[PDB]
Amino acid sequence: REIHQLISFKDVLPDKNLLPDWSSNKNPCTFDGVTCRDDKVTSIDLSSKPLNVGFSAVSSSLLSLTGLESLFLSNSHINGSVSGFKCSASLTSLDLSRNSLSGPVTTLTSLGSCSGLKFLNVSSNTLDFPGKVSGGLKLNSLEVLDLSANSISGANVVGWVLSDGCGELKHLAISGNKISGDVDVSRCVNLEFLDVSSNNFSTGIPFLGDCSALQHLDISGNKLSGDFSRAISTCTELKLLNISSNQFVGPIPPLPLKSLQYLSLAENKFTGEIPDFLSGACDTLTGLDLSGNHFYGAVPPFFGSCSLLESLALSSNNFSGELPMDTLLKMRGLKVLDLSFNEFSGELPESLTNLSASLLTLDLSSNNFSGPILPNLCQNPKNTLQELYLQNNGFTGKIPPTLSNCSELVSLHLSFNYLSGTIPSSLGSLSKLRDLKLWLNMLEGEIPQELMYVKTLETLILDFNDLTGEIPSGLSNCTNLNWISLSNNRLTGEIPKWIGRLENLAILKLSNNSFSGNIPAELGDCRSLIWLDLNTNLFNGTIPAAMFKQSGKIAANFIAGKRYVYIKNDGMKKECHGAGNLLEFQGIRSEQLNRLSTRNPCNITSRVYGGHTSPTFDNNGSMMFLDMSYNMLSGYIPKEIGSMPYLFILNLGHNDISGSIPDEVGDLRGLNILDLSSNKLDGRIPQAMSALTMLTEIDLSNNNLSGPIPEMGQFETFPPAKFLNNPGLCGYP
Amino acid sequence: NAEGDALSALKNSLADPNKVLQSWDATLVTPCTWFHVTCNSDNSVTRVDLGNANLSGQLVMQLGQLPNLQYLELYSNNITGTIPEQLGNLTELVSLDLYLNNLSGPIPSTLGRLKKLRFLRLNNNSLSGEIPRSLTAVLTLQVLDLSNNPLTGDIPVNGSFSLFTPISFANTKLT
Ligand SMILES: CC(C)[C@H](C)[C@@H](O)[C@H](O)[C@@H](C)[C@H]1CC[C@H]2[C@@H]3COC(=O)[C@H]4C[C@H](O)[C@H](O)C[C@]4(C)[C@H]3CC[C@]12C
Numbered sequence: 001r002e003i004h005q006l007i008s009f010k011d012v013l014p015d016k017n018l019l020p021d022w023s024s025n026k027n028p029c030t031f032d033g034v035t036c037r038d039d040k041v042t043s044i045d046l047s048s049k050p051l052n053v054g055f056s057a058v059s060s061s062l063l064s065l066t067g068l069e070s071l072f073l074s075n076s077h078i079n080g081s082v083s084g085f086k087c088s089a090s091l092t093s094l095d096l097s098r099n100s101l102s103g104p105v106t107t108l109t110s111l112g113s114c115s116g117l118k119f120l121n122v123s124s125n126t127l128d129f130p131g132k133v134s135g136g137l138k139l140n141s142l143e144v145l146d147l148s149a150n151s152i153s154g155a156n157v158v159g160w161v162l163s164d165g166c167g168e169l170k171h172l173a174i175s176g177n178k179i180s181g182d183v184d185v186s187r188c189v190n191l192e193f194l195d196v197s198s199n200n201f202s203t204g205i206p207f208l209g210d211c212s213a214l215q216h217l218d219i220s221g222n223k224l225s226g227d228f229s230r231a232i233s234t235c236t237e238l239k240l241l242n243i244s245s246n247q248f249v250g251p252i253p254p255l256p257l258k259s260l261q262y263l264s265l266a267e268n269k270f271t272g273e274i275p276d277f278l279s280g281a282c283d284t285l286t287g288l289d290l291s292g293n294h295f296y297g298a299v300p301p302f303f304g305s306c307s308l309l310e311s312l313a314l315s316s317n318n319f320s321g322e323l324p325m326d327t328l329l330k331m332r333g334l335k336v337l338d339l340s341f342n343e344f345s346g347e348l349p350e351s352l353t354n355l356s357a358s359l360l361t362l363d364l365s366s367n368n369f370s371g372p373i374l375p376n377l378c379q380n381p382k383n384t385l386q387e388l389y390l391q392n393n394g395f396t397g398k399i400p401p402t403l404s405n406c407s408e409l410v411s412l413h414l415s416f417n418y419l420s421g422t423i424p425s426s427l428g429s430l431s432k433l434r435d436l437k438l439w440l441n442m443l444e445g446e447i448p449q450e451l452m453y454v455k456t457l458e459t460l461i462l463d464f465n466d467l468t469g470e471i472p473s474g475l476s477n478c479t480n481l482n483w484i485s486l487s488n489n490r491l492t493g494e495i496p497k498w499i500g501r502l503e504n505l506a507i508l509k510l511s512n513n514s515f516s517g518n519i520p521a522e523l524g525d526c527r528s529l530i531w532l533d534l535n536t537n538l539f540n541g542t543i544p545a546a547m548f549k550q551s552g553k554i555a556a557n558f559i560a561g562k563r564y565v566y567i568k569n570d571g572m573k574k575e576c577h578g579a580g581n582l583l584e585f586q587g588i589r590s591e592q593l594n595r596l597s598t599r600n601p602c603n604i605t606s607r608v609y610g611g612h613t614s615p616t617f618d619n620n621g622s623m624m625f626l627d628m629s630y631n632m633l634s635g636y637i638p639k640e641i642g643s644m645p646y647l648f649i650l651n652l653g654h655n656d657i658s659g660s661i662p663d664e665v666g667d668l669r670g671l672n673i674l675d676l677s678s679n680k681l682d683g684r685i686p687q688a689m690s691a692l693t694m695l696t697e698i699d700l701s702n703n704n705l706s707g708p709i710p711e712m713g714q715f716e717t718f719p720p721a722k723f724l725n726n727p728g729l730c731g732y733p
Numbered sequence: 734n735a736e737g738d739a740l741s742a743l744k745n746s747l748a749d750p751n752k753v754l755q756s757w758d759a760t761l762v763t764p765c766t767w768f769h770v771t772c773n774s775d776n777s778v779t780r781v782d783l784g785n786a787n788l789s790g791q792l793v794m795q796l797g798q799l800p801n802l803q804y805l806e807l808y809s810n811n812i813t814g815t816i817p818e819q820l821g822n823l824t825e826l827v828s829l830d831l832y833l834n835n836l837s838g839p840i841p842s843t844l845g846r847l848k849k850l851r852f853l854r855l856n857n858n859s860l861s862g863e864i865p866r867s868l869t870a871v872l873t874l875q876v877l878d879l880s881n882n883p884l885t886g887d888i889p890v891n892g893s894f895s896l897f898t899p900i901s902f903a904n905t906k907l908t
């Protein structure tokens with residue numbers, strides 16, 4: 001009978017090829033995902049099998065299994081909306097999450113026909129709660145419910161879920177929705193876990209009541225403020241308290257310390273000195289986040305007692321005084337220390353060479369530290385340091401090559417310092433190294449060829465240094481290079497015709513240098529490449545047609561997540577070139593950006609765009625940015641330059657580019673900024689260029705251009721200056 | 734700022750299937766960094782160009798909050814709804830392009846308040862009502878193309894409309 005339900009399911013798969021070991025002859029138990037207990041089937045798990053079918057399919061077939069205790073469909077691409085269905089009193093668990101499920105959330109009430117079901121996780125789907133809040137969920141036999149990261153918007157929806165009463169509910173998670181207003185779990189006396197993160201609660205700070213059982217409270221990521229201390233005082237039973245990303249103000253309040261292990265008060269309005277009373281919480285306290293608040297003074301020494309604290313992060317506060325080594329050696333718990341964005345001062349303790357052995361990640365960036373980088377830092381044979389963030393500090397003198405002695409180092413960021421003399425060739429030996437960021441320093445000489453023995457090297461950011469000489473060729477051995485930013489150097493030579501070999505290269509920025517000679521057509525071989533900023537240079541040649549060849553097949557999702565700035569070119573200064581500067585900023589501070597002033601002429605009177613890198617497409621996209629401005633680059637701009645759907649900015653300015661603008665230039669739909677200005681281009685501006693409906697900027701100025709301006713479309717919104725100096729042009733608009 | 738608040742209210746009333754408004758960031762200080770939104774040297778909004786975003790939705794009242802807004806192009810979308818009279822509270826303005834939409838209801842008389850307005854295309858929509866005699870008022874308007882939506886009530890010549898061909902009327906159920 002049962003078997004036949006299981007093949008009855010198999011039918012609906014489109015896509016019959018999944019569940020191949022499911023066949024009528026065999027005994028159901030031998031089936032993929034099918035688990036039996038005494039030769040009867042208690043559970044099916046199809047997880048991460050692309051079922052691509054309706055929910056009501058699944059339930060008609062499976063949920064009717066006499067005796068089935070659980071079903072796991074998570075990430076099955078289960079489609080549809082959850083209806084009433086006949087269901088057995090033995091199915092106690094359902095994982096429908098990482099799915100496509102739709103409708104009102106009220107759909108879920110139907111599951112009341114499944115009488116034994118204590119476990120539901122629907123998270124990461126589309127459920128919304130469209131009209132207005134009342135009725136109930138009326139699923140009260142539930143110990144665990146996870147509705148998180150769905151499409152739900154409302155208020156007292158938390159009240160709605162718990163409405164028919166919560167008594168046996170241990171675990172409740174509604175995160176990553178828009179739910180708002182009041183939370184009361186006060187009735188729920190078994191409740192060990194409440195996750196309300198990433199929501200709209202601006203008002204009620206939850207009412208936990210007795211709080212007898214609660215070990216996990218995540219109220220992070222709301223507009224929530226108000227007195228939380230008094231709220232949570234009833235517990236002392238609690239393992240995690242996450243109140244981060246909220247509106248909380250004031251001194252760190254009395255909060256229960258007995259079982260507290262993780263505590264993040266991070267990213268709030270909290271002011272004051274890290275309190276003594278915190279204290280005995282060191283018994284456990286395996287991690288602490290006070291970062292992003294108003295705190296000052298220095299790391300209170302009692303922090304030597306948490307030998308259980310793996311990671312202390314104090315980043316972005318007023319903390320001052322020199323680097324508290326006295327405390328820092330005492331906690332042999334410590335793994336990551338984040339001191340970033342603070343007023344810590346002084347030279348770099350010798351006395352610190354030890355951390356370098358214990359520590360995974362040392363983040364000292366954006367502080368006042370001076371003198372050089374301890375050559376002796378990595379002298380321990382023991383040394384584990386994965387992540388060294390010394391960027392944005394006052395460190396003088398050469399990069400210690402002895403630093404290679406840190407052999408676990410993946411990310412080395414020395415940037416925004418005063419470091420002089422050359423780049424250690426030494427660094428070539430860091431065999432696990434991925435991110436290397438040296439930009440805005442006084443480093444000179446050549447870009448060390450040895451960097452080739454790094455087979456994991458992903459980032460390379462050299463900007464605003466004196467580095468001379470060509471591109472090291474050995475880099476063609478770096479398979480994982482994605483973001484190469486060499487801008488603002490004296491670098492010579494050409495683009496490597498091998499550059500097209502790096503499947504992963506995404507952002508290549510060669511601005512302000514002397515790099516010369518033709519634009520390599522092999523550039524069209526790079527599946528990942530979305531940002532090409534060649535501006536202010538000595539390049540020869542004509543834009544090749546092969547250059548775009550890959551557009552439309554493009555996947556850039558690797559480069560995604562890296563933090564940056566864009567400084568947009570004011571244009572108001574004669575001297576300043578390009579469309580704009582895309583700079584790596586991680587842990588470099590915003591307000592120290594003027595430290596750039598003397599190297600880059602541009603106004604920081606500008607608007608600085610910025611945030612974490614996110615390509616607007618996953619797969620089958622196009623080159624997102626191209627600036628070839630200010631070169632001797634010349635000739636016919638190919639028809640193929642139309643082949644870039646996702647291209648945001650095109651600046652071909654100040655060149656000898658000649659001939660006429662191809663009609664296809666109308667098909668760059670995602671083009672917001674078009675600058676062909678200051679060229680030898682002639683002829684007429686095709687009215688098919690009306691098609692750029694997102695354009696906020698045009699400059700066609702300084703050409704042999706003739707004819708009328710094509711008014712229908714965005715063109716009329718553009719001040720006539722931007723068409724100036726085309727004697728043969730028919731328009732003003 | 735109140736401006737980011739406003740445009741936010743728009744990102745809500747709107748529906749953004751091509752995710753053009755994604756970059757609009759409600760925590761941000763100003764919405765000056767948003768995509769397609771732009772500002773002056775003083776960090777107030779001078780533009781919003783969502784024009785042809787495949788974006789659907791209703792326009793919204795908070796849209797009146799952008800007093801330095803000049804060019805606003807909501808044009809060539811699936812936008813439904815009426816044209817909010819606080820659109821008139823946007824005193825500076827140049828171009829108003831609602832053209833090529835499904836916007837329903839009266840062409841608001843409050844546009845009589847935008848003296849700087851140099852462009853009006855209420856063109857190609859479905860609108861219902863008079864024209865105001867208050868758009869005779871403005872006199873700048875080097876173009877008004879409102880066509881293709883049913884109005885009548887008359888075709889004004891109070892005369893600021895003196896400067897317009899009827900090519901500007903095309904099917905108004907007019908006169
Ligand atoms: C995908 C990566 C390469 C990239 C860093 C990416 O994540 C990044 O967020 C991109 C898409 C943004 C950051 C800076 C942006 C540009 C900043 O420059 C500007 O001129 C603005 C103004 C205006 O709003 C335009 O519509 C967008 C426009 C022209 C932006 C277009 C999109 C960007 C280029």
Ligand SMILES: *[C@@H]1O[C@H](CO)[C@@H](O[C@@H]2O[C@H](CO)[C@@H](O)[C@H](O)[C@H]2NC(C)=O)[C@H](O)[C@H]1NC(C)=O
Nearest residue numbers: 074075097098121122123124144145146171173
């Ligand atoms: C609900 O299911 C989701 C997705 O199946 C679970 O989220 C994953 O769980 C693993 C283990 O916690 C984590 O490593 C990931 O961070 C989670 N991914 C997601 C969706 O963020 C979630 O744990 C489930 N919740 C319950 C109560 O079972």
Ligand SMILES: *[C@@H]1O[C@H](CO)[C@@H](O[C@@H]2O[C@H](CO)[C@@H](O)[C@H](O)[C@H]2NC(C)=O)[C@H](O)[C@H]1NC(C)=O
Nearest residue numbers: 197198218220221240242243244245262264267
């Ligand atoms: C405390 O809460 C914050 C915010 O809800 C958590 O932050 C997020 O962690 C995930 C990684 O799984 C990131 O993708 C998010 O971007 C983070 N947000 C922030 C604050 O930047 C934080 O992890 C929580 N702490 C713990 C350990 O539970």
Ligand SMILES: *[C@@H]1O[C@H](CO)[C@@H](O)[C@H](O)[C@H]1NC(C)=O
Nearest residue numbers: 512536575576577599600601
């Ligand atoms: C490139 O480098 C020099 C060195 O300062 C700088 O002065 C010049 O302005 C830079 N060129 C551009 C366009 O920034």
